[model samples]
Target chain A: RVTDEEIKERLGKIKSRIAVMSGKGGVGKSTVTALLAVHYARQGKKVGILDADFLGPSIPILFGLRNARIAVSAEGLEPVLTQKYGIKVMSMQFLLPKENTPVIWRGPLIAGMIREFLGRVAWGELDHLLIDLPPGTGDAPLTVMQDAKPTGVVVVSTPQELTAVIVEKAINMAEETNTSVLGLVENMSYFVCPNCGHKSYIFGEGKGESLAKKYNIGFFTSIPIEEELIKLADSGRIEEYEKDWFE
Target chain B: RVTDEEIKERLGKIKSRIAVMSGKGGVGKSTVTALLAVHYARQGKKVGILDADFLGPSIPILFGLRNARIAVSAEGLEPVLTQKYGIKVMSMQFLLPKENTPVIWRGPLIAGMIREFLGRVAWGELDHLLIDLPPGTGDAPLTVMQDAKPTGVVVVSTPQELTAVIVEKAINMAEETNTSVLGLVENMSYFVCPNCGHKSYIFGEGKGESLAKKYNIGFFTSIPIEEELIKLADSGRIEEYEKDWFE
Candidate 1:
């Protein structure tokens, strides 16, 4: 069992720790996390990202580090350094024997793994460490909130009623755990036609902003459904993408 | 604790049972499940659907039954019947006091709920019972596979390498449990341009077909990303949508 002191000791080197979470799936939560990490890394902040999305660890794939393995020393596990911007990354993907191996674990086991990731990773002296959480307010998020003790959380959602409602639940979970919500990000907010430049609210609009206002949280940013971003992410070159919508 | 015999007794009422699952999220697993249920219902089959995606139940909202509640009686909890096609549906959404309420439980709790949903629901002799599982090979899918004992499984994935890799894990889980894979459905296989009417494989191609051939499982269908389908699903009128791409 990982103790709180162990977690605190490991995290003490990091300056600011934040988590990116969502209530619903497929809202570009992991994509937003990768972008945020890259956005900070471009400013040369010595960023470290802990991909806590055990079931669907996209960090390695997003950074083109799918074949990279985490090194182990007497101290603990060493995070894989990305070729672009030297972002220190740790994910369950690195531990798996193969890409298709599933981390089929239950709640307590998942929580234990999260705690181990926080306590055992040798992420020494970093400007920021962003945790990419799995969707929903379950064991993984709870473990991160209590053990890692992120300073604030960034919630991702779409501009639809279904996603908005669930995103609100994530906000509430953060509040209940005494964690400050950094902001809410509206992803896939709209689709702009490449030919005629027509704007379409495919999933409706204003829910993310309205949710931010309703909960008194910061309305972070809106991300459009861009074909280029999809292509870049698919090819594992998301960091090379010049546009930082978060800025 | 739920006994295996009790589960068997409950499942005996349904003719053929199958589950739709994916190891990765945002691959439109639930949408495909809804489409399949609607497809079967359109054929005049006595179909019932169990929305086992407890953390993010989209089945209720997709069928425009968000406000509908489950009716409990001496027999069992009655599934909500959709107005469009009278498809019997049961979801965690019906048990929530409101739409935004999150079912924040750990793995054991989630498994318990799945057991109760399967064992206690008054499904009443149906031609088919389809379960829409949450994204990942976790407790929900494990419970459904072990206890509910679905005759076959339908795995969903995208054409991207990341999704295909993770989806293979889902297939492995089914094999470990001795369940036959009915087929594999590839959602968002391609996108069609609205203005020029040109088709594009936005996330690349052939991974799903290759996966099916590798596993000797049937490649059921490939679904395109269309704006009309997204609009229909978002507005909770998925049942009213005419296209049955699976058929």
Candidate 2:
């Protein structure tokens, strides 16, 4: 009898699996995933971002991935390669019967669908695969951790105390589940006044580093809330923004 | 045995129920709900906000709800009254066993829990009760509409096309469910330079008004992403912030 050792045996080996999560939406977790993927892609490394959301944030939208038709050859389900960086992207939006059809399935069923679809996709050998998970430390993200077995978890959060409280619970969820914490990315961390340089932690501050220390995580980064980046993100030109948080 | 008709019959008569929704989290949907609840409270009208999310955005945190002890007396469940306007607040976090317990319930189960908890709240007569729905046009919001029977729905979104695409599905969900559209609030809609005093739609623009018009909605408003507001919100002093969008 065939065992489960070859469960997800695709030719293109995924060298590194980075699954990104956030306590809530709007903290820009998915966008951070996009930026990280782009960074690796820019360095001439093969990268891919799994849109772990069932029908949530469209990772494809940020990359101007419109009219992307998947290839279902005899080999298996092929992912859509981007026009810009050619970063192989696999998102549920591309698999929908049509664009804009609201999800009719219930909650528990979606997780099952996520697992089945992930196993079917034939991602060729890639340097990194950043999984953009749906917001919350719930069943959807839990399924990914168990199935895909990500290399590590990147938790995203804002600087507010209230935001931090919820984010801390997500961190605990990751820790309790036996997953290695990659670190936290404090998004929308601050804003800078243009004319004269003035930095303001408008969304509150100092919680990121403190939380990282308390959790004993070694890596953490802060991303400022810049309108320039916002403009590029909304226009589907995220890769064009040069002033990235990571040098 | 009492039926559900008299199931939620509290002493305080709820005159109008307005449930606020968003395409996703981070559009500041719950904050808008708080602002609206504050607006009504400021008018010398009785108001209350039902935190419809399971363990999502904390509405009470916006009002500095610390050391809040709910009064579950012989009468029924009593909500926490804010320090400022004394607007009543009912939320899951206050009801949880502790402050940091992650939700252990599954997807379909949480919706059931939401309905059960809502009917148990003993809100004294109030002029308006604003329900802050969790993100998405999914099961959680669906249960609220059917159970709470909100007078209308207020959809929130950002001024971006990608944002608008998801926002529209929420509008359709309301319309399909026969809920009246109150209006749409385009939050983080724009920003102004401090020194130059120049206004800019940094996150993209015009989607809110256009989407409202296309959907045949009558009311819509744009809220600028002012650092002053963010500062106040993050500090749990939302009521202290002047220059509200309503005014």
Candidate 3:
């Protein structure tokens, strides 16, 4: 178990720490986290990302660092740096022998891994360190909340009523853990027609804003379902791609 | 801990049990499970759905039973019946006081819940019972594999290489647990242009078949991304909405 002193000693250099979380999986939480890191990096802020979703760590793959491995330094474990923005990245993927090997760990093991990422990574001085957590108010998120002591949390959701309901649980969990929610982000909000340029509410409409209002948190942003973004993410060129969606 | 004899005695009543799982979340695993149950039920076969994704149970909401509650009967706990197909459905959602309350449980507790759902629900000799699992080679899937001893396992994935890679973990997990891989289904394989009726490989192409071929498993089906399907699922009218895509 990492003590509070040890965690603070390691993470105290970062200006702000935020955890990107969701109540349900597959709502583009990782995408939002990667983009948030990219968005901040572009703004000339030193940023580091901790991919705390050990089971399905996509940060390495998202930032085109799938084959990149972390280096052990005299100071500590060093994060892999992205080519375009040089965003420091640490993930369980970096420690795995192969990408396909499953990290079939239980809650205690996952919590231990998160603690190691927080207390042992040589993050150096950074403007922000964003932790991308797995979905639900479970072990990973709770560990981040207790150990990392993030300045705030960003909950991601979709426009569906079901997602909205689930996302509220995330917000309440953050509050229960004494972590204030920075805002809510709605991903895949709507699909825009390519030929006719008409907007279709594929999952529904405006539930994001309503959820934010109901929870009294900031509605940080709504990301559209764009083909180019998906293509860039798929091709491992997310850093090269520039989008002001979050701006 | 449930005894093997108890589980066998209860589960033997069903003709076949299939567990739908994914290595990662948000691959539309629940949606696929609901549709599979609906498909089998529409064939005039008795169907029951065991939503083993206790942390994020969406099966009840997907089938328009978001507010439905399970009742206690002389036999045991009664699974709620869907209005349209009369499909027997058991989910953690039905046990919650409200839909928004999250199930914050550890691995052992979640496994216990899965066992209780399996042994306690009065399924009444069904033709098929589909278990919708939370993502990863984790507690829920492992519990279902051990306790329920599913007849077969269906892995769901998208066309993205990441999904295919993670889903392979699910396949491997099933193999490790001595569960047979029935086949794989690729959800959101492509997006159809509504105006022109042209199919666009939004994520990528041919990855699903290649994944199945690589693992030597059946490529059972590929479901396209459709507006109607998304709307139906979001509005809890999935039972009323019909599409033969999986057929």
Candidate 4:
């Protein structure tokens, strides 16, 4: 039901659109995406996060806006702004009638929702918009790539060989869709012992870089599993716990 | 179109079909499912695992059958038996042309695959069949619940408040679909530091139980993150590693 012209008009003000996708969850895709948004927001740039992960929308919860609801404006649906960085946020979590109510939607329905979010949500003048895709090479990811037309894609994964195998599927999808992969982020790449301050490859080491090398994708940075970050994220204060892992 | 009669005949031989679901990835859903299968197998029951998580099939890798392919028989598609435990496994990973090549199929196509796997696969007289649903309350999960008609659903989640929030979405889905949720598993609930031998609630504590209690779902168990399990699962020797997580 959404036309390309409507999407362009809605998203045209955004300078750059980046789609963040992970083949599966718990690899820290949303965490990494939030941190990236924090990175850009810390630079005083206008930023927005379009959480296309309809099934598991984390942006709202990460931002501690789980109870926050968006208002419908005359222009369109208004995006909720974060408490700290004021990053514009749009997620399906906000649209749910209740926390436990599942979307129970099919692929076409989800694809339409992403398009509707992109074209209908009032995300005004965002310098950068980060789209968080659900875990798959399926309809949602396809809609973000072929329909929303992100400027680039960033694939996220952990160091486990099993995870790497699934992540390659995402990289291959990006290649097939002709989307330029900006790089790969190996979230939970390691764990730093709190007491001894020792770094351990809890899952596996260097596998992220290996996948990137194999596919000729850029290796961004490895993020360790930090207790402080986890606490902050769980408490919805992730934007406050800042580190430039991107640097 | 998949007829109901075909599914009944194919799945009739399976004594109990349990579907393991997590609304998002990284909650140890597959791990819990595998360990559950191991539990039944250890009891000397004829067990089988149907890796319905097409987006990221972890069963083959967990059982160290990443490279194994299914053989076409005159009867139907054959399930690959694990070397150590002899547990039959059918996964999309084996059907892939390559490990990294993404399925790139939409929701309807995935639903079809799940039905095809259930009906066409010759799972001969399985005592118990565990279906690992992907992270969402979407297409694949619906097919397993509505069409395949499993005995019960087990929801997986971490102690992270964010993950727990998303997990409720799945439980809600099961309830809405009239599918009974057996219980909730709080995987990665805590971390035991090897250095100090101190147990830590890396995420939040009691959230899993709270979620279960709040939703009237059974609280199964809390599984701490262990280095050995991670290594074993990554190394493709999960069957050799024993744990009574289910018990």
Sorted by TM-score (best first), the order is: 2, 3, 1, 4
Clashes per candidate, residues 3 or more apart or on different chains = 0, 6, 0, 1
Worst 10 residues of 2 chain A by lDDT: A1-10
Q: Please provide TM-scores, in order, for all candidate models, with all chains considered together.
A: 0.72, 0.75, 0.74, 0.68
For model 1, how does the per-residue alpha-carbon lDDT over B53-128 read when each residue is reduced to its tens digit? 7566678778878666878888788888988888888877677746554454455556677888898888889888
The candidate, 1 or 4, that scores higher on TM-score is 1
Highest DockQ against the true fold, candidate? 2
lDDT of 2 by residue, B74-144 (tens): 65678888888989887766756356433433466466555655666777678798888877677777777
Worst 10 residues of 4 chain A by lDDT: A97-106
For candidate 3, the docking band is acceptable
Answer with 1 or 2, whichever has the higher lDDT: 1
Q: What C-alpha lDDT does candidate 2 achieve relative to the native structure?
A: 0.72
| Between candidates 1 and 3, the TM-score winner | 3
Please, what are the lDDT tens digits per residue for candidate 4 over residues A126-213?
8899998886666667767776677788887777633556666766676677667888888878777777666666665757776777
**Model 3, A1-247: lDDT tens per residue?**
6677887899998889998887545468898899999989999999999987855667777777766677899978888889888899988777774565435446566778788889888999998999998776766577677787888888877775335557667767677777788878888888776777667666667468766777777656888887788888867788877787777
lDDT of 4 by residue, B1-247 (tens): 6678998898988889888887645458888888888989889999998877756667777888755677899868898998887898887777773565334345555777788888888898888999988766766577677766787788877765335566567667666666678888888887777777666665657467777777787657887888789889867788888678877
DockQ of every candidate structure: 0.28, 0.37, 0.34, 0.33
TM of chain B, each: 0.91, 0.87, 0.90, 0.88
Expressed as tens digits, the lDDT of each residue in A1-247 for candidate 2 is 1113543564226788888887645358878888888889999999987777754545777787776567787756788887788888877677663565334345775676566555666776887988888886767677676666677788887765335566567666666666677777888787776756666665667478777777777688888887788777766688787865655
Candidate 1: which stretches are off by over 4 Å?
A1-13, A24-27, A54-56, A66-78, A92-125, A137-143, A146-152, A161-179, A210-219, B1-27, B40-58, B66-80, B89-155, B161-184, B206-220
Isolated chain A TM-score, each model: 0.90, 0.87, 0.91, 0.89
Q: How do the residues B82-119 of candidate 3 rate in per-residue lDDT, one tens digit apiece?
A: 98999999876676746554454465667777888888
Name the candidate, 3 or 4, with the larger DockQ value: 3
